């Protein structure tokens, strides 16, 4: 009777059986469509491709992400993503297993209700739940008191949790993500005279961003240093063989999480929004949030982000109230792992929204029973 957990990213789908160590299916949340006429009659054409199927063919295709900033869009493609996830990649019918889904803290209220409507009506899922990602990051970390910086594609948010209470008024949502870091890396790479126009090379730029980018422990000296000496320049081989070379740029791109102004963003950066989120808590707990401070999600994976975070938030902390930054190396998966363990808890078995209850209450049931 093992449940399913699929963490619906904006960049990846992560899914597996509840209680596994780590997920079986990880594939990009892209739908691909052909943009050319096929010449060879009897090619065996088919209209649309999902994930690794699309990405393997992307030069022939155009690729839409159906999720922007955690907001599901173009939902027929989302329904295709889920259908592929259960039927092809898991190979297991959804009507046999309850299912758990993950969402960014603050997003348009109808979206949960429509997602639920799909899950019951299309798939006849026995029972369903939705959980706030930055809760699950603490289940994953083995912590009951926490502040969580969680960022992937689509969204960033802070949530403070003290001893299993969330503190809703303190929740800061910030809309920087690996998507905007990618679009910036494209525009700035044009400064060195390389051009990337379409979705099919967007994923090349993303692969560059994954391998080469890193965060400067101090930016402003190293910006001048790399312009002064080339030892920080490094080079990478595109598909179709031509090599490109990237220097100061590779740190300059992820620095924009700390300097959102470069993208033209008004807000504070992740460090200052973390500080403001702690400041909204009552002073009884601020020391305990300062210490037990946890990174979550793939955007955090840039080397040196943890030491940069510790250095920069030290400058806002009153020096007595010491701090620590818990970055486990799994953390790209932590939001999934916390849902895997959560769905296995006996106490949780009460919490499932059953089909019988949805029949009573309609799509509005989600906010009434759930968080």
């Amino acid at each position: 009777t093992t449940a399913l957990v699929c963490d619906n990213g904006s960049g990846l789908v992560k899914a597996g059986f509840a209680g596994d160590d780590a997920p079986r299916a990880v594939f990009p949340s892209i739908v691909g469509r052909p943009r050319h006429q096929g010449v060879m009659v009897g090619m065996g054409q088919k209209d649309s491709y999902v994930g690794d199927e699309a990405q393997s063919k992307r030069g022939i295709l155009t690729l839409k992400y159906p999720i922007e900033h955690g907001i599901i869009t173009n939902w027929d493609d989302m329904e295709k993503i889920w259908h592929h996830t259960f039927y092809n990649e898991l190979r297991v019918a959804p009507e046999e297993h309850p299912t758990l889904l993950t969402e960014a803290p603050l997003n348009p209220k109808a979206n949960r209700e429509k997602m639920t409507q799909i899950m019951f009506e299309t798939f006849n899922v026995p029972a369903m739940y939705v959980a706030i990602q930055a809760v699950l990051s603490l289940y994953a970390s083995g912590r009951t008191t926490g502040i969580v910086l969680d960022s992937g594609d689509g969204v960033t948010h802070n949530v403070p949790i003290y001893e299993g209470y969330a503190l809703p008024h303190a929740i800061m949502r910030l809309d920087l993500a690996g998507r905007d870091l990618t679009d910036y890396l494209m525009k700035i790479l044009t400064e060195r005279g390389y051009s990337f126009v379409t979705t099919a090379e967007r994923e090349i730029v993303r692969d560059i961003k994954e391998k080469l980018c890193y965060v400067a422990l101090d930016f402003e000296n190293e910006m001048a240093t790399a312009a002064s000496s080339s030892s920080l320049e490094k080079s990478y081989e595109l598909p179709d063989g031509q090599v490109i070379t990237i220097g100061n740029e590779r740190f300059r791109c992820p620095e924009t999480l700390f300097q959102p102004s470069f993208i033209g963003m008004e807000s504070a950066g992740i460090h200052e929004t973390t500080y403001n989120s702690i400041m909204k808590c009552d002073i009884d707990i601020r020391k305990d949030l300062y210490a037990n401070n946890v990174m979550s999600g793939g955007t955090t994976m840039y080397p040196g982000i943890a030491d940069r975070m510790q250095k920069e938030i030290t400058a806002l902390a009153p020096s007595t109230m010491k701090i620590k930054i818990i970055a486990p190396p799994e953390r790209k998966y932590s939001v999934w792992i916390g849902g895997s363990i959560l769905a296995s808890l006996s106490t949780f078995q009460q919490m499932w929204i059953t089909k019988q209850e949805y029949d009573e209450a309609g799509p509005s049931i989600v906010h009434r029973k759930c968080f």
């Binding site: 922007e68 900033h69 907001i71």
Partner: peptide
């Protein structure tokens, strides 16, 4: 989204 931003 529906207003202030493209989603």
């Amino acid at each position: 989204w529906x207003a202030x931003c493209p989603a």
